[PDB]
Amino acid sequence: MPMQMFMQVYDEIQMFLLEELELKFDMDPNRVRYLRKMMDTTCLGGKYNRGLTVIDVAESLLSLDGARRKRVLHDACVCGWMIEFLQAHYLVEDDIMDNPDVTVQCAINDGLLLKSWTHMMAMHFFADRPFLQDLLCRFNRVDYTTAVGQLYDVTSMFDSNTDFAEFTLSNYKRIVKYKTAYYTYLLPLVMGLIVSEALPTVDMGVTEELAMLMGEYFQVQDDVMDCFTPPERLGKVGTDIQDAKCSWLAVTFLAKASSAQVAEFKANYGSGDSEKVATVRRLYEEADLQGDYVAYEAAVAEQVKELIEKLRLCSPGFAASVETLWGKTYK
């Protein structure tokens, strides 16, 4: 029922958006079909973890009358597609960042449309909901937060706009929090609470802390996999070393390497050269970073498991949905 409902609502949102373009925006069929294909290409195919989290949160909060239920679950699905479309928008923007060219014009246009669609679907489906303004404001603030996170990320290896000054655990956590944790972990949880009209019934502090911790757990595992998981298993080519990213491996290595090992890391980091990437990997391996990875994740897991209990004392149904979100990350 969750996935089936989520896909049924996608068809509903898509038909609304496309009929609106045809009826109110003067769009010709060739362009409508082009946008149907583009929307399917960019919004479908993933795991829908962000979107499905909204549904899971709402169902927990209404179970713990069928007129309110049907409405809350539909609202949860629209909110879920708002986050999936926001994610689709970020992926398009990232694809331009890693590239009279009409393909680049179309990618920029696609990025703008996908973001505009999050507002169009909200303004329509939640038109007479009293939560519309708060939902829009929290969504916009989270989107802004992500752009700020991207600035921190993209400029991590620079400043005074090659320096390893910002290669610290505190800065790594700043990047993860802003760039990923707010829209991936916090926003789905918050949206599920908004639609359920149960936003003031939860300790936001513990929830924000949980979102940041789960985001941190996810990114550390993501960083390790980028470097060590082979492309056929990973589903992409890992480029963090070449890109000179402020990764968990890089910041952890710099705190435990010797002066000559740091000098060796500095001379080989941020290069496309196969042997320099391999030298970096050798340094991570020899510094027993994969042993430290196990313990770091376990300590984060202990903190997550503890905070869910504090949340469960005042918000039991919500804590079980935060538990399922965690199980999807801990997997």
Added chain:
Amino acid sequence: MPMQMFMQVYDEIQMFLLEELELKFDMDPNRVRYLRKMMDTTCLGGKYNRGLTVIDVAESLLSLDGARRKRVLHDACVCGWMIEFLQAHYLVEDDIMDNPDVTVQCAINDGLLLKSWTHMMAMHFFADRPFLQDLLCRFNRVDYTTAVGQLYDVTSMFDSNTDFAEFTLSNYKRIVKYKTAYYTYLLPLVMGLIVSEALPTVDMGVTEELAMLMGEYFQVQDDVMDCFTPPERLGKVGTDIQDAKCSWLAVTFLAKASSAQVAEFKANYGSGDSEKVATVRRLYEEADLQGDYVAYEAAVAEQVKELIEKLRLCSPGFAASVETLWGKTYK
């Protein structure tokens, strides 16, 4: 007083946005100063016609108590900077469209921040205004409209996503309406009405029609200047011919050229080659398009002058501000 007030409010908005980043978003001074410079580079230096239109509309509607006045004029300035920042965002996106590259990453990031800033400044300055929701919805709808206009523009010379099928006056007007007229002419006028709480006191039909007509007048003159005004006088290098744009010159020429002249236009349009661009210019000159330009603009001017009178019958103060907006275009 208008420009002085507008610039004073810019300093206020800038300091709010930058202090918010420093205090609430964990931003380091080097990045705050970088964003201050980027905001100044992208948002300042223009004529502020869109932003100043908001101020001019508000002042007409409150003159025709100092507590309501001071508030309405400040609100007009924030709305004006929302449109100027929206314009700054479109220009950045256009600059990416005409281009581990950190400069491209930063331009994409700049585009996202400038748009997010329109929401951040609205959510703060209008936090307890009853018009906040309507303002956000009308602004978002206009932004979406512009992205749709960009799709029509960028794909005008294509379809089934080189065809001159879409090189028609009706399609030219569709591009102008969506791509330019809604955010340049309609939005400043609408925002000035919103802040003045005088939105239901005007015939929206005549206003929308005026915005579309002024946008059309502006674009026809802009298209002609792109082709015939030399770069030192124009302030840019005119590239419409090379880019194979659906310009007023191209659509007007195709309706009055002979089969062999159309064949000559088709073989030379959309090329960077100096002699092919010159052949296109020769065709426009020989088809007496600059004679037709004079009459087309005069007919549009007659329609504009007439509709302002209809508007003046029920909304006199507003009509004088629509007259000043028109004088800035007719110049």
